[PDB]
Design a binder for this molecule. Structure first.
Ligand SMILES: CSc1ncccc1CC(=O)N1CCC[C@H](C(N)=O)C1
Ligand SMILES: [Zn+2]
Length: 139
C-alpha cells in the first residue's frame, strides 16, 4: 500500500483505490494502474519533472529502501491477476529488484522528487507507474 499527496490530490494504484477514492474521483486510467482522488488537506510531496533513470524505492516486504537503475516509461506486457486480464500497461518503468504484491504503492524518488509508485513485479524485476508527465498535479 501507499499513496502520493500533492496539493489537493491523492495518487494511488487504481487496483487498491477505496470507496472514498472513487466517490471523490478526479481521474483514473486502467491502462496505467493509476487513480487520483481529491483531498480536503494540502499535500506537500514534490513531483519530479525530469528524465532521470536512477532513483531509490521503498520496499515494504523488506522494510528497506533500495537504489535502482530503471527503464524509460513504456508499454509493457503484464500477466493476468484478480484485478486485470493479461494486457499491456502503459507509462511503466522496470528495474532489477525485489517486490511482492503488497509492495504496490511504495514511492520511487530521484534527486528532483517523486517519480512514481510500485505497480508490478515478478522474476526479480519491479515495475513503477510513472507520474512525471501529469503536469496538472501541481495546479
Ligand atoms: C509489486 S506487484 C508484484 N510483485 C511481485 C510479484 C507479483 C506482483 C503482483 C503484480 O505484479 N500485479 C498484481 C497487482 C496488479 C498489478 C498490475 N499493475 O497489473 C500486477
Ligand atoms: Zn530526476
Amino acid at each position: 500500500s501507499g499513496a502520493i499527496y500533492v496539493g489537493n490530490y491523492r495518487v494511488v494504484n487504481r487496483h487498491l483505490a477505496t470507496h472514498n477514492d472513487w466517490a471523490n474521483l478526479v481521474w483514473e486510467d486502467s491502462s496505467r494502474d493509476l487513480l487520483v482522488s481529491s483531498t480536503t488537506a494540502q499535500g506537500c510531496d514534490t513531483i519530479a519533472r525530469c528524465d532521470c533513470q536512477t532513483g531509490v524505492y521503498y520496499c515494504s516486504s523488506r522494510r528497506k529502501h533500495y537504489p535502482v537503475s530503471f527503464s524509460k516509461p513504456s508499454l509493457i506486457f503484464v500477466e493476468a491477476s484478480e484485478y486485470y486480464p493479461a494486457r499491456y500497461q502503459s507509462h511503466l518503468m522496470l528495474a532489477v529488484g525485489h517486490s511482492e504484491p503488497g509492495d504496490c504503492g511504495g514511492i520511487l524518488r530521484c534527486q528532483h522528487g517523486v517519480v512514481g509508485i510500485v505497480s508490478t513485479g515478478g522474476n526479480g524485476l519491479v515495475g513503477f507507474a510513472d507520474v512525471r508527465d501529469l503536469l496538472w498535479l501541481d495546479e
